[PDB]
Amino acid sequence: LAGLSAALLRTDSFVGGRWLPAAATFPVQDPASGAALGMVADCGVREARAAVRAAYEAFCRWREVSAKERSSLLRKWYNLMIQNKDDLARIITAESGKPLKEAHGEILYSAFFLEWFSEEARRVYGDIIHTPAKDRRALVLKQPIGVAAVITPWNFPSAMITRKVGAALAAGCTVVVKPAEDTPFSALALAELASQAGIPSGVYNVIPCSRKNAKEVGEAICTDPLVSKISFTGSTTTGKILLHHAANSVKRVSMELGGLAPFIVFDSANVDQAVAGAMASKFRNTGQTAVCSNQFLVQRGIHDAFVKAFAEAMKKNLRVGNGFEEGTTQGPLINEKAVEKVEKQVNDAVSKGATVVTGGKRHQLGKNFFEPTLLCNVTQDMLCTHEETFGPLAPVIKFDTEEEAIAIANAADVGLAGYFYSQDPAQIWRVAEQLEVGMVGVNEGLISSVECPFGGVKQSGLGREGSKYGIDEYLELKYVCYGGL
Ligand X SMILES: Nc1ncnc2c1ncn2[C@@H]1O[C@H](COP(=O)(O)OP(=O)(O)O)[C@@H](O)[C@H]1O
Contacts with a second copy in 78-97 (CB under 8 A)?
Answer: none
Q: Could you tell me which residues come within 8 angstroms of residue 326 by beta carbon, excluding any fewer than 6 positions away? A: none
Interface pattern 436-465 for a second copy (x via CB under 8 A): -xxxxxxxx--x-x-xxxxx-xxxxxx-x-
Yes or no: say if 275 and 283 are a contact pair by the CB < 8 Å rule: no
Q: Which of 234, 372, 445, 466 binds ligand X (CB under 6 A)?
A: 234
Instruction: Give the end-to-end CA distance of the chain in Å, rounded to a whole number.
Output: 70
- Taking the alpha carbons of 282, 283, 287, 289 in that order, is the dihedral positive or negative? negative
**149: Cα separation from own chain's centroid:** 16
Binding mask 34-73 for a second copy (x = CB under 8 A): xxx--x--x------xx--xx--x----------------
Which of 97, 153, 166, 331 touches ligand X (CB under 6 A)?
Answer: 153
SS3 for 464? coil
Min dist. Cβ of residue 251 to ligand X (A): 14
- Closest to ligand X by CB, 164 vs 303, is 164
Contact between 389 and ligand X per CB under 6 A: no
214 binds ligand X (CB under 6 A): yes
Restricted to residues 66-125, the positions that interact with ligand X (CB under 6 A) are: none
Write out the H or E segment, with its range, that includes residue 18: strand 18-20
Task: Tell me the one-letter amino acid at 127.
Answer: D
The residue among 153 and 332 lying less far from ligand X, judged by its C-beta, is: 153
CA distances from 283 to 7, 280, 356, 370 (A): 33, 6, 17, 12
Q: Which of residues 164-183 bind ligand X (CB under 6 A)?
A: 178, 180-181
Which residue type sits at 312? Answer: E
Q: How far is CA 334 from CA 103, 200, 367, 390, in A?
A: 15, 34, 10, 10
Report the alpha-carbon distance of residue 220 to residue 334 in Å, rounded: 27
Query: Contacts with a second copy in 194-223 (CB under 8 A)?
Result: 210
Q: Are strands 296-299 and 393-399 parallel, antiparallel or unpaired?
A: parallel
Closest alpha carbon to 158 in 199, 194, 122, 123: 194
Q: Does 241 bind ligand X (CB under 6 A)?
A: yes
Q: Is residue 336 exposed (0-12), middle (13-18) or buried (19+ Cβ within 10 Å)? A: exposed
Stretch that binds ligand X, among 47-55, 71-79, 145-153, 445-453 (CB under 6 A): 145-153
268 makes contact with a second copy (CB under 8 A): no
Toward ligand X, which CB reaches closer, 174 or 233?
233
Q: Least separation, in Å, of the C-beta of 223 and ligand X?
A: 11
Query: Which of residues 4, 11, 21, 219 is near a second copy by CB under 8 A?
Result: 21
Q: Which does 218 bind (CB under 5 to 8 A by kind): ligand X, a second copy, none?
A: ligand X
Report if residue 11 touches a second copy, rule: CB under 8 A: no
Nearer to a second copy, 193 or 279 (CB): 279
CA distances from 136 to 126, 140, 483 (A): 17, 13, 4
Selected from 123, 215, 244, 319, the binder of a second copy by CB under 8 A is 244
Distance CA 315, CA 432 (A): 31
- Select the residue interacting with ligand X from 61, 212, 215, 478 (CB under 6 A): 215
Q: Contact between 146 and ligand X (CB under 6 A)?
A: no
| Cβ proximity of 245 and 223 under 8 Å | yes
Q: Among all residues, whose Cβ is closest to ligand X?
A: 218
Cβ-based nearer residue to ligand X, 218 or 438? 218
- Show the DSSP H helices in 333-447 as ranges: 336-350, 402-409, 425-434
CB of 404 to a second copy, least distance (A): 11
Q: CB neighbours (10 Å) of residue 335?
A: 15
User: Does 438 sit near ligand X (CB under 6 A)?
Assistant: no
333-362 positions binding a second copy, by CB under 8 A: 336, 351
In the region spanning residues 118 to 147, those forming contacts with a second copy, defined by CB under 8 A, are 127, 129-131, 135-136, 138, 140-141, 143, 145
Distance between CA atoms of 252 and 230, rounded to whole angstroms? 6
Interface contacts to ligand X, rule CB under 6 A: 151-154, 178, 180-181, 214-215, 218, 234-235, 238, 241
